[PDB]
Amino acid sequence: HHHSQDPMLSKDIIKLLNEQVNKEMNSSNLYMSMSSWCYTHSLDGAGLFLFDHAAEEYEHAKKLIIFLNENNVPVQLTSISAPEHKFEGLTQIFQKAYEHEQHISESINNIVDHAIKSKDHATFNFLQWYVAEQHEEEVLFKDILDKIELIGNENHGLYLADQYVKGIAKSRK
Amino acid sequence: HHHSQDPMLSKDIIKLLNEQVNKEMNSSNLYMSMSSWCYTHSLDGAGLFLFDHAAEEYEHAKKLIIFLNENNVPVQLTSISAPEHKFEGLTQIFQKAYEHEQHISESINNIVDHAIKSKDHATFNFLQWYVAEQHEEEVLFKDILDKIELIGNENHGLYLADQYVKGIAKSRK
Amino acid sequence: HHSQDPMLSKDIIKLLNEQVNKEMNSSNLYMSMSSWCYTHSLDGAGLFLFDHAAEEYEHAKKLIIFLNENNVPVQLTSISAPEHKFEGLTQIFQKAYEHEQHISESINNIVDHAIKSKDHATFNFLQWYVAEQHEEEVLFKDILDKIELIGNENHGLYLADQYVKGIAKSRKS
Amino acid sequence: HHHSQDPMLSKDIIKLLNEQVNKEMNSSNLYMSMSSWCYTHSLDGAGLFLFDHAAEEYEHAKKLIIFLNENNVPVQLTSISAPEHKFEGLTQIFQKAYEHEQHISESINNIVDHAIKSKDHATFNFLQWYVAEQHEEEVLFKDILDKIELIGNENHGLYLADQYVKGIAKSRK
Amino acid sequence: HHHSQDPMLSKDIIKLLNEQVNKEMNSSNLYMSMSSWCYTHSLDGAGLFLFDHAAEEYEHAKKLIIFLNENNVPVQLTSISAPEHKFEGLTQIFQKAYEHEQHISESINNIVDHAIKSKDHATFNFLQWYVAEQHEEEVLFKDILDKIELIGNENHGLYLADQYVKGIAKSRK
Amino acid sequence: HHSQDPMLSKDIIKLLNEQVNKEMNSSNLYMSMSSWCYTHSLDGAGLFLFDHAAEEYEHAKKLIIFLNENNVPVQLTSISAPEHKFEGLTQIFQKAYEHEQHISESINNIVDHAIKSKDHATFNFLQWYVAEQHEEEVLFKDILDKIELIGNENHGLYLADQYVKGIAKSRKS
């Protein structure tokens, strides 16, 4: 029976990275459920945007998995819990989403900080695409929320907001 | 508050389709775990193959979700249980995977049968890409298992089998 | 209507606003140095310092863009009248090299603060600025070295100014 | 030390042109401040437009500096006063901006009139691009102000005006 | 005689970088020695791979030298110790090589950590290509070692492993 | 398993291994000379000597390739720390020209030995190396001649360094 090389990352980094894979998986499902809510409530602009965003979060999870694989680090996938499926409206969904993105940013900042502390610059260096893309996503959700709040809910507001989000969804493809 | 149109599909079809979305997500996670096992045991050929397969299974889940959305059907994502993470070896993985693909095939046949029975030919028609692609995947796992069993474990069987699987992984893009 | 709070922390906000104002100050200083050269028959150094002044303003704008995207109010201060009287080409470039050293130090301080506060969105953003500033600092070191090597005696000024003219034109295209 | 040729322009025209450089630098900062107000109050359309306009005014200052340099005229940069940062809204910003553009137009008319009186036709001729471009800008701000007033601030007014201005910003770059 | 500008880097970072140049030169010779062992024991696959890798490490030493030169830092080349020439086989060579690459990775992490502590972000930023490329190389040697151990040394094992490595060598050039 | 004996004779083997080590020694010497120039405001000579050092290592690699193809073990010795203190540009190039003369003589000795031992495979192989070394020796003769002709007095160093810079750039492309 053949010997395979030990994991190339430290136990703490392994734990944080596996946690982050699972976080992105859970995020993807949350966005799918938010998307479905919009599609079933005549908001197909927000539905599309959120569907495409969900898909992109899963793409992040896969990229993290590739990095674990290349370092001989076992991927430890946990149970993914059922996402929230009940929502109040467009504004509430994007408020929740923006808060979620802020949490995701914090979690990445935490991994990068630990990489610095343990002098794991292979991991620091690898995470830079992820820091950059997440910041763009966070800024995007801030802007969409700003626009939704600016438009409001009075006559045609929901329509105008959804068409604004539709345009963003299409321009990002 | 505005009226959105009722779901366009029957209750039984909605149920089976939502269950299928969750099946494919579970499958994806299983295949990521199997992939990780191969990568951490010097079988990067099977590692790559199973990773790419896992990603494709999630692609199926997304295509099913799109169809639910277009029909105004709420997507009902349940809790994805943690996949098995411990395996005996390459043959055992592909034995398990082939059996799993047989089950997925059975589950799709079941939905197609119900579409015929309830005269839902929009859904029957939509699922044809999925029947075709799943048949191709099931045949693929049968072929890989056949080849792994033909090669065997006696030296240098594992290496040979993994290089064979590597070749398939690369050729499928 | 409600707009989202600044996405950066108070200390980072202040350091970045201070940096915008530093680059604006720097731009004017170089415009003044450039004018001295142009009015003292040193059009090569004149062109070089003009084009460098414009590039420093480009950095200020890029910092402003980042503040804007993070919902951070830009605080522009009074820009001090730059020094306008100079002794000669060597003194101008000694002053400029010393100035570039100070700019490099101020960027290092911001990057250090980002690390300490776990702001990796800002850390990552600043990397183009660290790289470009290092290139600029090296450039002024090289020009100063060349001016020192040439000297002021017989045609020294002419030779040094033509050398700087070559650089100015090579950096355009 | 070597002799350099005297300034090729008269004392009065030197004074007027140097004042104009400082005026354009001041205008640039005012527009950056107005831009930032819009960006931090969900008006990214006006934010972008005003940012790009701020950059243009600085481009005007650079072209005037080049002309001063070519005539062996010392560039005299004065302290640039901190810009206004307190604004009440979109309409007030553009009312202030239109009045400011009218002031800039007058200041250019004054220099051109002095060139005529002084028989300085080199400067008269040089300033034609600047007269033309300023006229375009003044008209532009008149049209945007006319539009913001037509739309108003009632039920979705701010959003409509901002999108209108966003369209202009994008078509100009 | 003329005055040249002082070294732009700190004493500690100068020492670390100069040590690294000498480390990369030493690594280059070690790999040439390992390459020659393979070439003279019928393993031209490993021979080529290791030769090309030796050349790459020297390329790393050159890039570090360029950076030292641009910062006016004296390059301090020390005596390069003769490399090990005694080897037991293919497996021992790659076990030694993987351990060596781990040492190189650690040494780079140490310099990057010192740049952070010193707030030398010019050097931090410069070293990113080197962190990335070293990680790639370390992973590469892990994968080759994993493969050599999977194949083993029984009935045609050496030939299979060498051909495997030959394939990698060729795909990298 | 049995590998074929070295294809070259003991004396040729020794001379060729000695030559690999000579070129490695030479490469470091030129790196050291290059660094002296770069740290003494002679970046033209710095670049030239850096690029020349790299070319000498290229010759060493080409000699290694020939040893490898003939099943000849490469014997790498300790590489002596090069001289690092120099008096000036003229002394560096006098030393280098004298060094190139010695390298030329060492090649002549190997070619002579090949003729005497009837080793025409090695004679024929070495022809690229004879030609390139003659070109390099002539080059250093020409640069030394030019430095001697220019001299050290007023701008002499600058002129000589710019001349060498021209050559350095012309030899790249």
Curated annotation (Swiss-Prot), chains A, B, D, E:
InterPro entries (alphabetical): Ferritin, Ferritin-like, Ferritin-like_diiron, Ferritin-like_SF, Ferritin_DPS_dom, Ferritin_prok
Positions of the Ferritin-like diiron domain: 8-152
CDD domains for this protein: Nonheme_Ferritin (cd01055)
Residues reported to bind Fe cation 2: E57, E101, Q134
EC number: 1.16.3.2
Keywords: Cytoplasm, Iron, Iron storage, Metal-binding, Oxidoreductase
Chief subcellular location: cytoplasm
One GO cellular component, as annotated: cytosol
Domain of life: Bacteria
MF term (GO), any: ferroxidase activity
Localization terms from the record: Cytoplasm
Binding site for Fe cation 1: E24, E57, H60
GO biological process, one term: intracellular iron ion homeostasis
Residue ranges of the TM segments: none
The reaction(s) this protein catalyses: 4 Fe(2+) + O2 + 6 H2O = 4 iron(III) oxide-hydroxide + 12 H(+)
A Pfam family per the record: Ferritin
Reported function: Iron-storage protein.
Similarity comment: family membership: Belongs to the ferritin family. Prokaryotic subfamily.
Known partners and oligomeric status: Homooligomer of 24 subunits that assemble into a spherical protein shell (12 +/- 1 nM diameter) that can sequester at least 2000 iron atoms.
Matches recorded under PANTHER family: BACTERIAL NON-HEME FERRITIN (PTHR11431:SF127), FERRITIN (PTHR11431)
Identification of the protein by name: Bacterial non-heme ferritin
Top-level taxonomy: Bacteria, Pseudomonadati, Campylobacterota, Epsilonproteobacteria, Campylobacterales
Gene from which this protein is expressed: ftnA
